[PDB]
Amino acid sequence: TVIPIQHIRSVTGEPPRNPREIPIWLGRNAPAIDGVFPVTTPDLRCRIINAILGGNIGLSLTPGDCLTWDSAVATLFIRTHGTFPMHQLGNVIKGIVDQEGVATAYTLGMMLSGQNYQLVSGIIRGYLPGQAVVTALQQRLDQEIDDQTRAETFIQHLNAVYEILGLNARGQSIR
Amino acid sequence: TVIPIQHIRSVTGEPPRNPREIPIWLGRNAPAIDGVFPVTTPDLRCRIINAILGGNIGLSLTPGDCLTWDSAVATLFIRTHGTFPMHQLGNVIKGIVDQEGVATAYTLGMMLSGQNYQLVSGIIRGYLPGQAVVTALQQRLDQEIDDQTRAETFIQHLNAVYEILGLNARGQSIR
Amino acid sequence: TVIPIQHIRSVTGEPPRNPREIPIWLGRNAPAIDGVFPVTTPDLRCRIINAILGGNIGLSLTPGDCLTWDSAVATLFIRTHGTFPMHQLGNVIKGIVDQEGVATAYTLGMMLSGQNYQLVSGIIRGYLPGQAVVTALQQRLDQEIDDQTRAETFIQHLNAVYEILGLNARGQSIR
Amino acid sequence: TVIPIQHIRSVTGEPPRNPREIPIWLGRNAPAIDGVFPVTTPDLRCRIINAILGGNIGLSLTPGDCLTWDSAVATLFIRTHGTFPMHQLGNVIKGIVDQEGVATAYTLGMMLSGQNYQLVSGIIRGYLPGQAVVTALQQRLDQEIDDQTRAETFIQHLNAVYEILGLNARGQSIR
């Protein structure tokens, strides 16, 4: 095969030069890249990741690393931050909430941790924008069946509760 | 099934930064997008929209919100301006009437509103060129049988009235 | 299908900024476009025109408008100039013969005036380049059996008289 | 069905601005265009000329005119110069020998005249660069069996005689 790199690299754009911003940059373009091209085999994830990173030192992956987007995003964290990602999940989540917003930090949160709803849910509930929201969001997530049902319906609920109070993704008033 | 994003960007350009300026940019550039690469289902429209807006998780859509290029546009306007933003919808429409004219202000307004004949009809009738037009246009639309039918035959009737009086699109004379 | 946009756009160039000029510009670059990519169906004209004129939602066409290159140019004229009273058809046509010449002004002239031969034939007669050409043309049109055939063979006969006298499209001498 | 217009436009270049230069510029570039992409039908030859010229010029041809490259080059000469190319054949050939030398002027002179070897040879014999070149070239051409084959091997024989005297393509002395 040959990967359509002309296209994939228009969705994504050019990467950040500060190289401990990279795992979060690749983390939040992954959903888009999967729409524009079906990435099925770990060989193609590795090929795509290595193409879009270009000439950066020590930052090529192996197909061993790139089994899921998570596993890859965790491996590029370990080679930049030095630590494992799940020895500072708290600080990383808080840092994203402040720049990008809750629905972003939720998403990267469950890439880095490894689809651990319990933990990431609890760390986020900390950084929600005001007490009122926290109570609102909680009663919606308590009326699902399982924690498997809650990890699909979490963004759907946050987006409904922010409509009522009139806030804007980054958690500021529209009003 | 490679969505050719590089070509679609060649025609539309880059979307704005200030995400209050995204919902109209998407309505304006819609019939260009659809000429380069023709969409068919909601599925594809989702995959195209998300890929254009890039690595933005906050303004990401789902198939549910994308039956039509209008349903997509409406959903984004409620996330950015909030519901019942009637003073702002007043202001985006008054702006267009001055640059473009009333038949453009009508279609963009009706797109951003979720095809709300009653609201947008009302706003435009305050920005028409002079008392005699308002009255002539209304008498024609009142003869029509229901509100679905008025929304169909509005640009039609506005033209007929503007032609008699000898105005061009921007409501200035050609006699 | 797959419309070769970035090739078509290399060949035509950029559409002019004052949009009153567009309609005559889409006429001159038609036989170039048909070179690069043969436009068969009206659905394909719409797609190509819409992608060229970019994010200008004022000028978007439908299959309904663009059946022939001349139908499409006629519509785009109406929207940039306005619908005229018949008594002013003369003043539109004159203008065009000074830019483009008689064969242009005839064709648009019949589109704008419900394809009526008597009116626009009678108007054009006035603006030909010299007495000789006028009588030269008539005799060829007076051998024809009815006004239906005259309406077809008008361009054909006009070119044959301009050949003989040694005149360019604008009706001046080639030297 | 879709011609490679990107590749052909690299081989030719931009057309010259002064349109009395166009009909010879197209004669020089023809045999290279035949190499890059094969041109078999009139309908193809038409399209390639119409796309190269580009619509700023307004020199559109038809599948009747573009039958053979010489018939196309013939037609464009009339619509710029106003005369027939056979009105002054000497004064065209003498021009092309003063810039590009004998082998260009042989090649366009056969194009304009309609493969009239007997005439074009008789004209160019006058403009050759010195008595012994003339008498040396006319020894070789008199040795070959017929005139069909003389017109084939003419440039093959000319390049030889320029070698043995040490002149370049523009008939100047190399030393």
Place this chain on the structure above:
Amino acid sequence: TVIPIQHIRSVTGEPPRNPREIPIWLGRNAPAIDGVFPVTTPDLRCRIINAILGGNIGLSLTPGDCLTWDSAVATLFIRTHGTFPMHQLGNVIKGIVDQEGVATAYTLGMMLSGQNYQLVSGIIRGYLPGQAVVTALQQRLDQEIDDQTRAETFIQHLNAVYEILGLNARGQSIR
């Protein structure tokens, strides 16, 4: 086959202006090229390198010189610097562990030295990043069988130790 050069040449970028900088630039950018287009044979490595470096008849390789990317990078090194004697292998390697770090310098030193594991292991032990690394790495290599296994397990151990101590490739702490 024809190779996708325009795509490869958009992922790597322009090669540096000083040609002593070229042989390492090519090592950094190898994995990217393998991403765009998987390079399988020595032939295809040659074709790709020769096209990227363009007009340099100076640095053009053959299939002999490029079996593996590490052969090419060595051959290109010998040209741009010159073959140097044993006592100068010190200043070559120290120069590189400063730019790129131990893993790069080990692989090139083993290549510019005819795989002299005792020499290139000895020199690299002076430029390791702290005494506790020097000692930890030694123990792992020591409990291997012979020098041939030690040569092929070196980079495996280096990285394992660098991981525990939490260093990046350039050999500096990131915690």
Place this chain on the structure above:
Amino acid sequence: TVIPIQHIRSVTGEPPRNPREIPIWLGRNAPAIDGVFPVTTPDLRCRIINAILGGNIGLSLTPGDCLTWDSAVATLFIRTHGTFPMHQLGNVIKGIVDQEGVATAYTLGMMLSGQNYQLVSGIIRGYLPGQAVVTALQQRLDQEIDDQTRAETFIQHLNAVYEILGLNARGQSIR
């Protein structure tokens, strides 16, 4: 069967205007051209060269002249510089020796000369750096059997001699 002239010409660039400068320009760019697009038959070599030099009939090769790249470049040298142009071939060569060193000069200087070992050997020996270089290279080349052999091993032996004395490519010291 399209020759892709836009890809080739993105790697080589635009050939120089002064027709004396061409033969060496095509020598330098030869390996990069066959990197982008693999030639095989003499036919295709002919077709690519004529496409590049464009609408230039004065420098137009035939398949007879194009067995190899070198055979083309020799023939084009003889059309522009003369037969036995030995003062001229002196200065192209000494020129390249003072920018790019002896090993390029031997390779280019050989193509321009149609692989005339004894002539290009002779020229270069008088630009080598110092008397001790000349004796040693000569002894090593003399130990060879045939004159064909000597031209296969010439660069190899230059670099042995150069590497004892401790010189780089450009005849500069490396101590």
